[PDB]
């Protein structure tokens, strides 16, 4: 009894551990009860139980600080017991660790220890190492003396002493600033998938020998540079405890013929001697490029050598080889054969949430001013990867150091601790860093869960429900689809006038479903068509298969037909290279992958009709121009970004804009805003948009869909019945 599996925690606090309620009932404890955790090598820690709705019943969630003191790792099991006997301490002696007290001097108690305990009522245990962050530095402290033993709660009325030289770290404990899983921001799902593959073979090697199951031996990671491929490989080795050996293409290739092969073999021999071990091969496409693409004897031979060593992993017990490449199709296909590198994880580019998480991670030690808004930065940093956001945070910190602390600094190797602790980084310093940074991955497609919700779309209430029936019902009610022999649709095409919200509809359903949204825009379909590179369609669909659950949206499906002349063009048909590859991939995609494909076109009369056949976008939804009540809803939604006076009659405007699309109502909202801004500026050479600004905007705004086009759109929808 009372044995729980060690897992990760969300709350980074050095004293909180979370349990699922069924285990809180078996231990006869409640929220806030003090418990003791017993680990390995006669070590224990004292913590406060909280509860949540995310911990598994058999697991206990704790942060790195607790795991390090218990000398346990993720996947291990610890013993937990209540200890309601604890009362507040009297005197404690806490000293810093030398490893972190570098480049700094001053009253470390007032800077770090006093905040960390002040009205915090923290449990501590003799010998515990805890981390206090601040002043752009993460400083850890050891408890060396306590009047009560072995543990107590540090209360505001206790005496905290701190005198003596910094303590040298012991060999039985690891530095709390070493790369771990809590240093990785976006791509949390990918990290979870890797943990499932590596945590058990390495932490419990006896299990895979005793049970007839084969472990993964090779994991291929890929994505743009600066996304965390190397960061993961290092974090995994540090978290599991496996010996880490680094290999990189350029270094192996820099060696002479015969030396490159010998050195590559030695790396595998060292991993075996120190097993369990993880080998990380960076730039896999450089060390082992496609043989049929290289004329050099050395580049062709090194591929054979790596393939042999990878196969030898059946004899080299407990060795896992991870590799990183920029593109999964730039490596010799032999490496991807069963065995060797048979498992792959697409890291890709951090999404809007991940970018915020990365900014939060690289600011852990930074004191941010009240005006700092990292979510706003994450939304502006489009095309940035972890390497760029890390540089952004470092530049923001550096400018704050120049503005303030550089006036205060010594002609000496060490800063006053109080100076750094009082150094706050303002929004202006983050904005400056943003202007200096340049995204390293702006062209590659970014796949993420969209932030568009149903409340952002005016009108079309019935269409919103239709998408739910096409996307949610097949998996929310699978017993009804099986009972009635229903075949779920693989996708839907939206057709009708432009500017009615087709794009938002596809995003909104992806958002509610918590599914990744893949945005393929007209220019991307045109790029493949113009350059005769339709092969890239397979990579797009591969993203949908690996990103599942996801919604794969192909916008402006008629962009090629229009780029071919649209109304006239040549004498050919609607089929072309890009759409043909799309049709092929759709036929090879099963609904069991939880991928739903949505198309949109504003010229359905020139779309390849094959896309509407069973097995493709067989469902058709007509999206008309919004009606009067919908146009008002659109105007109200678009004006949520600006002050608007109460005199503005949005219903009157909607009555006039009878032939306007939603995109045209946006122009009216923006045009009236522009007038309000211009008048406000001129008044100093006003506080809100006035009725006169909307009535003036109506004098220039026009409908983008003519009466001739409205009838064409309606007659087409009528023909389809």
């Amino acid at each position: 009894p009372n044995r729980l599996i060690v897992d990760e925690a969300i709350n980074e606090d050095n004293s909180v551990v979370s349990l699922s309620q069924p285990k809180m009932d078996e231990l006869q404890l409640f929220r806030g009860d003090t418990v003791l955790l017993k680990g390995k090598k006669r070590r224990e820690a004292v913590c406060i139980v909280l509860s949540d709705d995310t911990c598994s019943d058999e697991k206990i969630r704790m942060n790195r600080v607790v795991r390090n003191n218990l000398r346990v790792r993720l996947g291990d099991v610890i013993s937990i017991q209540p200890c309601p006997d604890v009362k507040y301490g009297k005197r404690i002696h806490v000293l810093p660790i030398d490893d972190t007290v570098e480049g700094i001097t001053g009253n470390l108690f007032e800077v770090y220890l006093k905040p960390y305990f002040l009205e915090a009522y923290r449990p501590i245990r003799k010998g515990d190492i805890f981390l206090v962050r601040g002043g752009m530095r993460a400083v850890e402290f050891k408890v060396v003396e306590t009047d009560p033993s072995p543990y107590c709660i540090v209360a505001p009325d206790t005496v905290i002493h701190c005198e003596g030289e910094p303590i040298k770290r012991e060999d039985e404990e690891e530095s709390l600033n070493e790369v771990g899983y809590d240093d990785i921001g976006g791509c949390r799902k990918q990290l979870a998938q890797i943990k499932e593959m590596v945590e058990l073979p390495l932490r419990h090697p006896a299990l895979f020998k005793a049970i007839g199951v084969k472990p993964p031996r090779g994991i291929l990671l890929y994505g743009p540079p600066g996304t965390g491929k190397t960061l993961i490989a290092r974090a995994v080795a540090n978290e599991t405890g496996a010996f880490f050996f680094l290999i990189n293409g350029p270094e192996i290739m820099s060696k002479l013929a015969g030396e490159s092969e010998s050195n590559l073999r030695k790396a595998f021999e060292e991993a075996e001697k120190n097993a369990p071990a993880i080998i990380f091969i960076d730039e896999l496409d450089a060390i082992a490029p496609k043989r049929e693409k290289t004329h050099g004897e050395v580049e062709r031979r090194i591929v054979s050598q790596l393939l042999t060593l990878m196969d030898g992993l059946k004899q080299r017990a407990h060795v896992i080889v991870m590799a990183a490449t920029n593109r999964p199709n730039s490596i010799d296909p032999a490496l991807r054969r069963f065995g060797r590198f048979d498992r792959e994880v697409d890291i890709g580019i951090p999404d809007a949430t991940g970018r915020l998480e990365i900014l939060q991670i690289h600011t852990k030690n930074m004191k941010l001013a009240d005006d700092v808004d990292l979510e706003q930065v994450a939304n502006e940093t489009h095309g940035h990867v972890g390497a760029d956001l890390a540089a952004l945070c470092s530049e923001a910190a550096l400018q704050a150091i120049r503005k303030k602390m550089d006036l205060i600094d010594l002609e000496d190797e060490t800063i006053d601790a109080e100076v750094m602790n009082s150094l706050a980084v303002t929004m202006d310093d983050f904005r400056w860093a943003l202007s200096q940074s340049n995204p390293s991955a702006l062209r590659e497609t970014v796949v993420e869960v969209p932030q568009v919700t149903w409340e952002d779309i005016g009108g079309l209430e019935d269409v919103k429900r239709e998408l739910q029936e096409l996307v949610q019902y097949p998996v929310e009610h699978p017993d009804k689809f099986l009972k009635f022999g229903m075949t779920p649709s693989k996708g839907v095409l939206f057709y009708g006038p432009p500017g009615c919200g087709k794009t938002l509809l596809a995003k909104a359903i992806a958002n509610e479903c918590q599914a990744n949204f893949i945005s393929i825009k007209g220019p991307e379909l045109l790029t493949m068509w113009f350059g005769e590179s339709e092969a890239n369609v397979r990579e797009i669909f591969d993203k949908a298969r690996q990103a599942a659950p996801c919604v794969l949206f192909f916008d402006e499906l008629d962009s090629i037909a229009k780029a071919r002349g649209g109304n006239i063009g040549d004498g050919g048909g609607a089929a072309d290279r890009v759409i043909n590859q799309i049709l092929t991939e759709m036929d090879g995609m099963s609904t069991k992958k939880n991928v739903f494909i949505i198309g949109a076109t504003n010229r359905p009369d020139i779309i390849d009709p094959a896309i509407l056949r069973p097995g493709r976008l067989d469902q058709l939804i007509y999206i008309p121009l919004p009606d009067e009540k919908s146009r008002v809803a659109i105007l109200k939604a678009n004006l949520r970004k600006s002050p608007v006076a109460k005199d503005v009659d949005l219903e009157f405007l909607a009555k006039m804009t009878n032939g306007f699309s939603g995109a045209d109502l946006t122009e009216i909202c923006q045009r009236a805003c522009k007038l309000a801004i211009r008048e406000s500026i001129e008044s100093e050479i006003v506080p809100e948009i006035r009725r006169d600004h909307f009535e003036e905007a109506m004098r220039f705004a026009r409908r983008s869909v003519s009466d001739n086009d409205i009838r064409k759109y309606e007659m087409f929808a009528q023909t389809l019945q």
Partner: peptide, 20 residues
């Protein structure tokens, strides 16, 4: 018991502030 409920109150406050 009510003495350690003060550490609970501090922990719960730390957590719910960090939700901001």
């Amino acid at each position: 018991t009510n003495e350690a409920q003060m550490a609970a109150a501090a922990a719960l406050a730390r957590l719910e502030q960090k939700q901001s």
